[PDB]
């Protein structure tokens, strides 16, 4: 038996706030960070830059932290970054099987599905079937590699750049790099 979750969450807030342990505007400030600042649009910007700038691509793949810091996008749950490169024979996918660990500042907070027991249990063992069910077909001639986020490394996938985007601006490329492309369950599509 439990009180409604909203009542329990606000009780926790009120118990701490009522003892002076929560600075003024504290939870409101975090809410703004979570809703407005942490965003997969940032990861998309990084990918589009890497796609159009071989030098940055090299930095991103060798020192992800430094590359992300150049854009000012390090942050909570995103202080040590490793980018993992898809290739014609390799598809990378990220999970946190133990909870929900995600590169928050550049991917945004994890979505419900990524935190689901279904994804946490299944993608490590049957990633091809999981991606297929989610709408992404990965051929047998492609190695699937699942990164389980079990420590402090926070990952992003650098997907392959699709044919048909040659010459596109960074802005145009950013639009096709979605949250799901950064997690690795989707491949960027030409609209």
């Amino acid at each position: 038996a439990q009180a409604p979750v909203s009542d329990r969450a606000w009780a926790l807030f009120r118990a701490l706030d009522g003892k002076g342990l929560v600075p003024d505007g504290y939870v409101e400030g975090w809410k703004k960070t979570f809703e407005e600042d942490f965003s997969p649009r940032r990861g998309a910007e990084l990918v589009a830059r890497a796609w159009t700038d071989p030098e940055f691509r090299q930095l991103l793949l060798t020192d992800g932290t430094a590359a992300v810091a150049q854009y000012g996008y390090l942050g909570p749950q995103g202080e040590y970054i490793v980018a993992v490169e898809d290739t014609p024979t390799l598809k990378n996918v990220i999970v946190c099987s133990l909870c929900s660990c995600t590169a928050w500042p550049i991917l945004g907070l994890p979505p419900t599905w990524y935190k689901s027991f279904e994804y946490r249990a299944r993608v490590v063992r049957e990633p091809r079937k999981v991606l297929s069910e989610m709408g992404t077909e990965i051929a047998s001639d492609i190695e699937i590699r699942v990164y389980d986020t079990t420590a402090e490394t926070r990952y992003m996938v650098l997907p392959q750049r699709p044919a048909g985007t040659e010459g596109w601006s960074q802005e145009q490329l950013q639009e096709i790099v979605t949250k799901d492309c950064l997690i690795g369950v989707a491949i960027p599509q030409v609209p």
Binding site: D7, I144, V146
Partner: protein, 211 residues
């Protein structure tokens, strides 16, 4: 801790509730949902009452049926509340009074944790390693699917962090270790019963030994 939270490889679950690029809705689906993370950070960064590792562990310590029936953000409301009570900052009485009803918490720890091991090895990219065949009842950042298994180092971190098995219990002896991206063949982890290629687990130095 071999709890129900160690889900990787568990069989019997249905479809992931998502198709690619589908609308996931707003970041928060209810007006309270930003509270668990924000209050976690108040506890960690403002009060210094606990580490993030202690938050992971207190969630692992939910009674197993309770864990399995509780949505994500609610688990962190329960976990943060539990730590506040365990650290003597709040009482369960006042939480229940303010909530207007029952506010069951995670179960007490059954382990005092363990220190960062004194004896470890610095590994290099390309080296073959085995995950120590050890059983730890308290917090550990080793999913069971890789226990005792052999893989290859693909990265050694250029930073070091406290050993989760210690800091996750608030111990003073967590030291600092780098972690290693250890690549395992899918078949090393699940035999023939997998459709994948490889799995890379980010493992603390103290979980590893030469192969």
């Amino acid at each position: 801790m071999d709890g129900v939270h160690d889900l990787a490889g568990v069989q019997g679950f249905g479809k992931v509730p998502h198709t690619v690029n589908a609308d996931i809705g707003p970041t928060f689906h209810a007006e309270w949902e930003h509270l668990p993370y924000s209050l976690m950070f108040a506890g960690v960064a403002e009060l210094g009452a606990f580490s993030v590792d202690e938050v992971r562990y207190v969630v692992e310590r939910m009674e197993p049926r309770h864990y399995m029936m509780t949505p994500y953000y609610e688990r962190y409301v329960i976990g943060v509340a539990t730590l506040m009570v365990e650290k003597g900052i709040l009482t369960q009485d006042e939480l229940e009074s303010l909530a207007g009803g029952p506010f069951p918490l995670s179960r007490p720890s059954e382990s005092e944790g363990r220190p960062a091991p004194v004896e470890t090895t610095t590994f290099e990219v390309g080296q073959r390693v085995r995950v120590r065949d050890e059983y730890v009842p308290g917090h550990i950042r080793m999913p069971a699917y890789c226990r005792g298994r052999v893989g290859t180092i693909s990265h050694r971190t250029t930073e070091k962090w406290p050993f989760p098995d210690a800091i996750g219990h608030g111990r003073n002896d967590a030291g600092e270790e780098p972690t290693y991206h250890v690549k395992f063949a899918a078949e090393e982890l699940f035999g023939s019963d997998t459709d994948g290629g490889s799995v890379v687990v980010d493992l603390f130095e103290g979980y590893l030994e030469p192969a």
